[PDB]
Every structure is written in C-alpha cells, then in structure tokens.
Design a protein around this ligand. Structure first.
Ligand SMILES: Cc1cc2nc3c(=O)[nH]c(=O)nc-3n(C[C@H](O)[C@H](O)[C@H](O)COP(=O)(O)OP(=O)(O)OC[C@H]3O[C@@H](n4cnc5c(N)ncnc54)[C@H](O)[C@@H]3O)c2cc1C
Length: 636
C-alpha cells in the first residue's frame, strides 16, 4: 500500500534520504516519532499522486484525503508537499492543473534542446511560474526519441524500450500520455550465416559459456584488482580476451596430460609384449625337452611356465582395455570451434548493442556501475510510438524549432544564447535570459571542432569529464512488408556473423511490432562504419539474410524502409553515453554539476548527467526534473 509508493518513487519506505535530511534537519535531529510521522505523510502523498497522476495533487487535496491523525498537523503536511512538488516527485509530466498558471512570471530560463530532459525541465519550470523558452535545432521535438510514421507503419529509430515499470517514472508518464506498452517475448533463436538455426544444445552451451566468461571478468576486476595494466586502464574486451586465453590454455593442458597418460600405457603395452615374446621363447625351448622322473619334472616345469604366461595374457588384455578407454574418451581438442566462436561473437555483439559501443572501449571496473538501480517488471515496447511522450510533454510550451544554438554567454549579470535559423542561415536570433539549461547530447559537447561555443569557456574539470566519458553509437533498419512471413511468437531472432570484426552487423531482428514491421540492428564497430553504406545496399543485405533464413521466395520486396545514422546526425553524434575506460560514475555527477562565473548561471541535464540511470529516457526525465528543482531553488 503506502509501502509501494515509496518504491515506485525510488525511495526507501522506512528511511530518510540525504536530500530529505538536508531539507528537514529539524526532523532528523529531532525525535524518531516525528520521523515516522514525516515518512507516513510523504508515502501517503506519493500514493495519492500515483493512484491518480492525471490531475495535479494540491496541498488542499492532500490534507482532505489524509488519514485522521496526520491531517491535524498541517504545517508538516505543507512542508512535505512543497518538498515533493519542487523535486518533481508528485507534480511532474502532463497533468490537468486545477488552478491556471499566474500571468506574472518570476524568471527567464532558456533551455537548449527539446528532448525528454529538456521538455520535462521546461514543464516543471512552467509549473513553478517561470518564463521558459526552448531552442531546438531539429524540426521536431523528442531528440533521441524519434518515431517514424508512414501510412500504417510506426517504428522507433531512437528510444524504443521501457526497461521495466517498477520504480520507473515512465510508468506515471505512461498513464498521463496513454502509452500502448507491450511485453517483449524472451525467446531469440539464433541462425548461422548460412541460415540454419543453432540447435538448442549448442545455443545453450555457448550462452552458458558467455555468462561464465563475463562473471570471470567481473571477478578479475573486483576481487583480484585487475584494473590497471602497464599504466593503462583495463577494458572489458581486454579482460574477456585474457579469460578466453586462460580457458584455451586449460584445454591445451588437459589434452597434453591425457596424451601423456596414453603414451605411458602404450609404453607399458610395448614392454609387456616384449616380455611375452621372451616367455614364448622360453616355453618353446622347454617344450623341446629316473628318466621318467626327468619327464615328470620337465612337464611340471612346462605347466608352471604356461600358467606364468596365462597371468601375463590376462594383464595384456587388461592394459589393452585401459588403452582402448583412453583412446575413446578424450577431452575436447579446442575450446571453441569456428562455429562456437561465431555464436559467442553473437552474444558479444548483443552486449555491444546494450552498451552502444565496442567492448574494447568499456571500463572493466565500471561499465555496469548502474546495474543496482535497474527497474522491476517485464521490459516493454511502445506500440503507439515513443514520440507520443515528448509530443504530449510539448503541449503549451514556448518552443522555437529549426533554431540551432551556436554560442552561450554567461556572466554574473545574466546570459545570452545566440542561435541561427537552420532553414535560412542568414537570419540570427539572440535571447537574453537569467539562466541557461543545457541538454545538448554528450556527442555534441564532444565535437572536437565545437558546434556550440561557451563564453567564458567551460572549466577544466567539466571539459575533462566530457573528454573522458564515452558516447556510443547504435543503428536500426526498419523494413515494412505487406505480410508477416516470420514466426509471430518470437519477438527477436539473431543472425550470427562470420567475422569477429563484423559480429555486430545486422546481428538482431525485432518482430515485436504487431503490424508487419521488422527491425534490424547494427551494434559495435559495425555501427559507425555501416552509416557510410547506402540504404539500398543495407536493405539488400538484410533481405539476403532473411531469404537465407526463410526461403528466397518467402520474403517479398519491402514496401517501406528507413535507416538511422545516429553518429552522423549532427544533433546527436552517437546513440547514448557509456562508461569509457578512463571515466567512472563520478564523471556523470560532474556533468550534472552547474557552473558559476556569485550564483550559478549555466546548468546541465540530459542522459549523460544522471549517475544511476544513464543512457535512458527515464534518466533523461529524472535529470530534467532534478535541474528544474535546482534552478527553481536558486531563482525563487
Ligand atoms: C538508437 C537508440 C536507441 C535507444 N533506445 C533506448 C531504449 O530502448 N530505452 C531508453 O531508455 N533509452 C534509449 N535510448 C536513449 C534515449 O533516447 C536517451 O536516453 C534520451 O532520449 C536522452 O534525452 P536527452 O533530452 O537527454 O537527449 P536528446 O534526446 O538528444 O535531446 C537533446 C536535444 O538537443 C537538440 N540539439 C542538439 N544540438 C543542438 C543545438 N546545437 N542547438 C539546439 N538544440 C540542439 C537535439 O536535436 C535534441 O532534440 C536510445 C538511443 C538511441 C540513439
């Protein structure tokens, strides 16, 4: 009940956060009874909002719907409601305001970028009564939430998955926007380059081996401190190669030991056969041989030698048996055959997809630093088209499209943002504001010849973080057919590449859209390179793979096709951040920190500024809410 609202808000139900201790020092330093009352007021307020997030939750309503003991204490209820509303925990997203916004606005903020982070922060600042203007370079909102819509076909070229609802703010948004979320079936048969499926035994064996290898790299990093080598940071790819080499060495060693067991037994057989030949000489000589006493003696001796031979013949058979078993029970010659390595490279490509970067670039120590904060519940696709979310957030906002920022000026007095119209470069716009919120992607901030100049130039710590962090890349190919020729009960199926270098080329296909749309993925080293290929050629290669899997006659020519090129997109310059070898979690926090030339003037939000939820739409959303709170605290 009330316990669940705190979980849905990413908070502990029986504890107080660092932030709450800072804002409510009287309660933390006071008696624990007041703390329990505080926590119930907070949890109950969150439950009221989450039960019905389509309408603003007012202080008055909170008092009206509160329990009898706690509705008496109104000052505490107000303090709690104000705290939650400011930080974007109870009144965020699209909601029906019960009271219109005041005509008088108390501050001027220019927000660069109209992605989820920008739109969320703008909606919050508007909610708080500030004058907000968004500058967006594209001819559309959403940024890295891009939805292709033509005829009946709807497909996401950017963000496409809600990674669980338990604790996800996107849950609330989904109720506000009426997102059509659909579960993804966890079933992905693999098909080799020839088009024949990977049998279950091999699929399962390789997958088990992939998981074992990855856990091994984790052990090296954390237990053995294998993190710095020859004054260079260890990449995940490095560690994977180290682990693979150790396993290959174990195979060679076991094979060698078995070889030696066989040679020793073979040597024993050779020695025994020589011994037997000698005994046959002896027996054949004694056979050639009181005289009746002599006969009795010779026959006695001959039977003794013959029984002596019998013992050795039994032992001959027994050593022959041991040798035969060893000849028929060897260990594997190689750890991974060619086909084994290709299937394993498919799994590596899936990892490169998840992190939108080649594994040789991921920090071994920190590439999965955010795994502790992952959300509960089945992962979901957006059937309505993820663009439905930003478009809903944009309603009622002062958004200037086709306006590309080229300079940001910030001083102790105020700020200037200079922008150019992309449609006609000749006309230029100047916007004077109190504060600037930058949600420019990390790729755009990384641009060596800068697209946006800062006056004064950004400080050393900020620029160093921007250099250190990784900004990955990942691409999609949308194929729209008239009929479904694939298996509807599999949302995913893989294509195993021929080379380790190209393992990430069209390695994955989604058939998750209930309409006849197929989505082919380009991860790792292939992502950057294949942007330089024409769309007809990429689609021909996709068709070739699908023909190989289903029959050349079974796949028609597609009716519609679309290719994303996110690294070339000048407004993205990649897909989303990843934790590069040089970088760590603290760099994300550094991105989030604002700049002061006094009070702070330049603020930062976006996918690359939230430690615990990077590379995600919900992370963008939460960063937007966080910076809205920060700016409202500063200017109100
Ligand atoms: C292929 C792909 C798939 C993804 N899949 C998922 C997924 O399944 N789940 C998930 O959670 N996340 C996913 N993401 C990541 C997700 O899209 C981001 O985490 C999120 O959209 C970040 O939003 P943002 O506003 O911070 O950045 P953006 O969306 O990039 O917003 C920045 C905005 O600034 C604009 N801009 C850029 N330069 C300028 C300029 N000079 N002047 C003015 N405006 C400018 C851009 O046009 C853009 O609108 C995916 C990303 C990619 C590339």
């Amino acid at each position: 009940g009330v316990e669940g609202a705190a979980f849905q808000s990413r908070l502990p139900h029986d504890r107080m956060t660092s932030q709450e201790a800072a804002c409510f020092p009287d309660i933390i330093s006071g008696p624990q009874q007041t703390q329990k009352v505080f926590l119930f007021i907070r949890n109950r307020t969150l439950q009221l909002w989450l039960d019905n997030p389509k309408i603003q939750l007012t202080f008055e309503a909170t008092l009206q719907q509160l329990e009898a003991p706690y509705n008496s204490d109104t000052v505490l209820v107000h303090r709690v409601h104000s705290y939650l509303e400011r930080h974007g925990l109870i009144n965020f997203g699209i909601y029906k305001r019960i009271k219109p916004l005041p005509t008088k606005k108390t501050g001027k903020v220019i927000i660069i970028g109209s992605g989820v982070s920008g739109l969320a922060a703008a909606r919050q600042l508007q909610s708080f009564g500030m004058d907000v203007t968004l500058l967006e370079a594209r001819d559309r909102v959403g940024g890295r939430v891009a939805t292709f819509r033509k005829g009946n076909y709807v497909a996401d070229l950017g963000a496409m998955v809600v990674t669980g609802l338990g604790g996800n703010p996107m849950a609330v948004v989904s109720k506000q926007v009426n997102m059509e979320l659909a579960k993804i079936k966890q079933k992905c048969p693999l098909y080799e380059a020839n088009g024949q499926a990977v049998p279950k035994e091999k699929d399962e064996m390789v997958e088990q081996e992939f998981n074992r290898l990855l856990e091994a790299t984790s052990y090296l990093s954390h237990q053995l401190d294998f993190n710095v080598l020859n004054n260079k940071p260890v990449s995940l790819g490095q560690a994977l190669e180290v682990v693979i080499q150790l396993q290959e060495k174990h195979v060679k060693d076991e094979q060698i030991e078995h070889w030696k067991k066989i040679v020793k037994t073979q040597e024993e057989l050779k020695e025994l056969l020589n011994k037997m030949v000698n005994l046959k000489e002896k027996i054949k000589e004694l056979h050639q041989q009181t005289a009746e006493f002599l006969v009795k003696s010779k026959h006695r001796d001959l039977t003794a030698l013959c029984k002596e031979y019998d013992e050795l013949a039994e032992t001959q058979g027994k050593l022959e048996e041991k040798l035969q078993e060893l000849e028929a029970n060897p260990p594997s010659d190689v750890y991974l055959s060619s086909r084994d390595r290709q299937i394993l490279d498919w799994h590596f490509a899936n990892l490169e997809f998840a992190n939108a970067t080649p594994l040789s670039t991921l920090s071994l120590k920190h590439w999965d630093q955010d795994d502790d904060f992952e959300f509960t519940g089945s992962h979901l696709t957006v059937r309505n088209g993820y663009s439905c979310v930003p478009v809903a957030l944009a309603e009622g906002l002062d958004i200037k499209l086709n306006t590309a920022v080229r300079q940001v000026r910030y001083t102790a007095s105020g700020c200037e943002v200079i922008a150019v119209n992309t449609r006609s470069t000749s006309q230029t716009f100047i916007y004077k504001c109190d504060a600037v919120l930058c949600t420019l992607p990390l790729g755009v901030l990384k641009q060596q010849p800068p697209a946006v100049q800062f006056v004064p130039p950004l400080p050393e710590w900020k620029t160093s973080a921007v250099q250190r962090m990784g900004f990955g890349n990942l691409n999609k190919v949308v194929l729209c057919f008239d009929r479904v020729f694939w298996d509807p009960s599999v949302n995913l199926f893989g294509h195993v590449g021929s080379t380790t270098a190209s393992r990430g080329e069209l390695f994955l296909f989604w058939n998750l859209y209930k309409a006849p749309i197929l989505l082919a993925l380009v991860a790792g080293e292939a992502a950057g390179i294949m942007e330089n290929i024409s769309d007809d050629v990429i689609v021909g290669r996709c068709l070739a793979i699908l023909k190989g899997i289903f029959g050349s006659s079974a796949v028609p020519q597609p009716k519609e096709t679309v290719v994303s090129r996110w690294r070339a997109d000048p407004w993205a310059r990649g897909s989303y951040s990843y934790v590069a070898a040089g970088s760590s979690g603290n760099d994300y926090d550094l991105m989030a920190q604002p700049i002061t030339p006094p009070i702070p003037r330049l603020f930062f939000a976006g996918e690359h500024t939230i430690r615990n939820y990077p590379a995600t739409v919900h992370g963008a959303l939460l960063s937007g809410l966080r910076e809205a709170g920060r700016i409202a605290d500063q200017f109100l």
